[PDB]
Amino acid sequence: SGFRKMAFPSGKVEGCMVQVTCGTTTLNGLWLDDVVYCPRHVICTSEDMLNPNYEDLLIRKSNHNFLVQAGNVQLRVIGHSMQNCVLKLKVDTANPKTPKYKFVRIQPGQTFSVLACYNGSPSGVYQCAMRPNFTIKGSFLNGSCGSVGFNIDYDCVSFCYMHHMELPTGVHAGTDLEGNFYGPFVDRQTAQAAGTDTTITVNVLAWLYAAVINGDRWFLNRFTTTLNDFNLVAMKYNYEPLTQDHVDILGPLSAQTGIAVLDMCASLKELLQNGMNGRTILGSALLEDEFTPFDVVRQCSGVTF
Amino acid sequence: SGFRKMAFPSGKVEGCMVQVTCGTTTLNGLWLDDVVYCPRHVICTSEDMLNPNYEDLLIRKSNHNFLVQAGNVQLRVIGHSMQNCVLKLKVDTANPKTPKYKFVRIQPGQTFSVLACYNGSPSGVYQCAMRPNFTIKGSFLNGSCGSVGFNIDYDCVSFCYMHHMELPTGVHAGTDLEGNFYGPFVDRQTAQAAGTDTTITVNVLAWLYAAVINGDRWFLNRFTTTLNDFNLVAMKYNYEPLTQDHVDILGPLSAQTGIAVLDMCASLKELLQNGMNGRTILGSALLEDEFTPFDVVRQCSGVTF
Ligand SMILES: O=C(Cc1cc(F)ccc1F)Nc1cncc2ccccc12
Numbered sequence: 001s002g003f004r005k006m007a008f009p010s011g012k013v014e015g016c017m018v019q020v021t022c023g024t025t026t027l028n029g030l031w032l033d034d035v036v037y038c039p040r041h042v043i044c045t046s047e048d049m050l051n052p053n054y055e056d057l058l059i060r061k062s063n064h065n066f067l068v069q070a071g072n073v074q075l076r077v078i079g080h081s082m083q084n085c086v087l088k089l090k091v092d093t094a095n096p097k098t099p100k101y102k103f104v105r106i107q108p109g110q111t112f113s114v115l116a117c118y119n120g121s122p123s124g125v126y127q128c129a130m131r132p133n134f135t136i137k138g139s140f141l142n143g144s145c146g147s148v149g150f151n152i153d154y155d156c157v158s159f160c161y162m163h164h165m166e167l168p169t170g171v172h173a174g175t176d177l178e179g180n181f182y183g184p185f186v187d188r189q190t191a192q193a194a195g196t197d198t199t200i201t202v203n204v205l206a207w208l209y210a211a212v213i214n215g216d217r218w219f220l221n222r223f224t225t226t227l228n229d230f231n232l233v234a235m236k237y238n239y240e241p242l243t244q245d246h247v248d249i250l251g252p253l254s255a256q257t258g259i260a261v262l263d264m265c266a267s268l269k270e271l272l273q274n275g276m277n278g279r280t281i282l283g284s285a286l287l288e289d290e291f292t293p294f295d296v297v298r299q300c301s302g303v304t305f
Numbered sequence: 306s307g308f309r310k311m312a313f314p315s316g317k318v319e320g321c322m323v324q325v326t327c328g329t330t331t332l333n334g335l336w337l338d339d340v341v342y343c344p345r346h347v348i349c350t351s352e353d354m355l356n357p358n359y360e361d362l363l364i365r366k367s368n369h370n371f372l373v374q375a376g377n378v379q380l381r382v383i384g385h386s387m388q389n390c391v392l393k394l395k396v397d398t399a400n401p402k403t404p405k406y407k408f409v410r411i412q413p414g415q416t417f418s419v420l421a422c423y424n425g426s427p428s429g430v431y432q433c434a435m436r437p438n439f440t441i442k443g444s445f446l447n448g449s450c451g452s453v454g455f456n457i458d459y460d461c462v463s464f465c466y467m468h469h470m471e472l473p474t475g476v477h478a479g480t481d482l483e484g485n486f487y488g489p490f491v492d493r494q495t496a497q498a499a500g501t502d503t504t505i506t507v508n509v510l511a512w513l514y515a516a517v518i519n520g521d522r523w524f525l526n527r528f529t530t531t532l533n534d535f536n537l538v539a540m541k542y543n544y545e546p547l548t549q550d551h552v553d554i555l556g557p558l559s560a561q562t563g564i565a566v567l568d569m570c571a572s573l574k575e576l577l578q579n580g581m582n583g584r585t586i587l588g589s590a591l592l593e594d595e596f597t598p599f600d601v602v603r604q605c606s607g608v609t610f
């Protein structure tokens with residue numbers, strides 16, 4: 001029993017965190033094989049950030065300008081190249097702690113673990129979701145740039161996020177490990193804002209299934225709904241549309257609890273129109289949307305890595 | 306910006322998780338130096354559980370009755386001793402991944418990270434607090450016994466909890482790493498129940514200070530309170546009494562925000578009375594009590610917004 005916001009064990013990623021320094025700017029890098037990946041804005045000064053020409057700022061740098069520290073060991077940079085908004089620093093030493101990994105680009109609604117780092121040293125691990133507006137509600141301070149988001153499938157670490165910036169509302173923006181930003185964001189000091197966010201409907205349904213598995217059924221009802229009527233109600237409450245793919249993905253949880261997906265949608269419909277009436281679900285007075293259907297199955301079955 | 310329930314990076318603890326088997330029972334063990342620590346109930350059958358005589362069950366065992374597996378490597382048990390409710394298995398190999406560590410016994414209200422494990426393999430990491438009733442609201446399934454709770458302040462792992470059992474309400478009971486249970490619990494299948502739980506007042510106050518540091522002041526009011534009047538009100542909402550020690554501990558957060566501890570107590574009183582009126586504090590519609598004053602100082606900026 002119990003249901004917690006659970007992150008993947010971060011050990012395989014901790015062995016990849018390094019400190020990257022260029023001039024006065026210090027941030028984090030991910031050392032995989034003989035390459036260190038970090039945000040390209042490490043080459044910028046505060047004036048450079050206002051309108052950076054990254055190719056022009058980069059051409060002025062030599063390998064010895066990038067100080068890379070792996071614990072208390074300085075790595076020597078033997079090459080440097082840019083791929084989108086990520087800077088790739090070729091080093092002489094391959095990371096002996098390099099796990100089996102892949103670079104994956106995730107979709108909004110998908111969750112991942114973030115290993116927050118400062119000066120190449122991991123400070124904490126938390127779970128979060130890629131919001132439908134492509135921001136993440138992270139917990140980051142100055143120096144956290146280069147911290148990474150990941151998932152683990154079997155023994156393979158799938159790197160999906162690299163932290164680049166904080167938006168005016170305190171939410172975060174970053175890229176995949178190929179340097180492509182999630183969202184309409186740019187790595188530049190200019191006016192940028194998170195778009196109006198929506199609730200990840202399939203994740204709320206997965207969390208309602210987790211609550212039923214954990215013994216909370218007060219919200220269930222005798223009712224069902226059509227997928228189209230539920231989507232009219234979801235549109236009204238700033239909830240993401242629920243697709244047939246989402247219904248299919250919820251199949252295993254539906255079979256385990258004996259509550260049809262559209263049966264759970266009618267419980268959600270009632271919660272949206274009426275609220276919780278002073279009650280909680282899994283210790284929350286809000287409908288939680290940062291657990292995917294897979295996260296619920298993984299936690300309610302004890303999958304290991 | 307941002308405030309998340311953040312766990313410590315689990316890598317230093319992952320390198321200590323092993324599987325301990327005694328007959329048909331399999332659970333987790335913590336391998337530090339040449340000793341493997343695990344719950345002593347690994348030697349019990351299930352029938353044994355009602356009224357086990359651990360000293361009598363243990364005397365019937367030899368070292369080779371204990372099978373310890375670290376990854377795909379069997380460790381050889383060369384000695385065994387019981388210390389309270391923990392079984393200590395001396396092995397013939399010191400763990401080369403043994404971090405700098407210490408065993409600490411924590412008090413209710415203290416938080417720690419739990420690395421949930423099954424078959425000596427880590428599955429997830431989450432943050433939780435030792436409830437005032439000495440239970441933890443964990444997320445554990447069968448086979449999670451031997452999973453540990455820890456804090457990693459300045460490169461040293463402080464092991465504070467070892468998971469032993471699940472109570473009828475779905476909450477969890479365990480021991481420190483010296484085998485002393487937290488609370489009035491025993492490693493027996495007899496009728497045992499968690500005492501009525503209360504809210505960790507000092508932690509709620511710390512979290513309100515975190516919200517002020519992150520720019521949220523809607524809940525503040527022009528009132529103050531005496532420490533005794535706050536306690537008479539708070540006890541009526543099942544909140545733990547706030548002591549002078551708690552007020553002292555909140556001193557740094559009070560100085561950083563400019564809000565006196567008893568002024569924040571008056572906000573808490575009003576929050577208890579009024580609820581949130583459709584508002585949230587740090588993304589929560591409930592008063593969060595699983596962040597200590599120390600956790601808030603660790604995660605939040607030193608500059609208030
Ligand atoms: O946002 C940036 C740097 C930056 C990158 C960029 F692409 C455009 C403009 C910029 F300012 N770094 C930060 C990340 N996360 C949290 C922070 C908290 C406080 C201060 C900076 C934080």
Ligand SMILES: O=C(Cc1cc(F)ccc1F)Nc1cncc2ccccc12
Pocket residue numbers: 001346354445446447448449450469470471472477491492493494
């Ligand atoms: O509680 C026990 C075993 C046990 C230990 C003991 F000291 C006394 C009585 C006992 F039953 N195991 C479990 C631990 N955590 C979570 C679980 C979830 C489901 C089923 C078992 C779980």
Ligand SMILES: [Cl-]
Pocket residue numbers: 052053054055
């Ligand atoms: Cl450019």
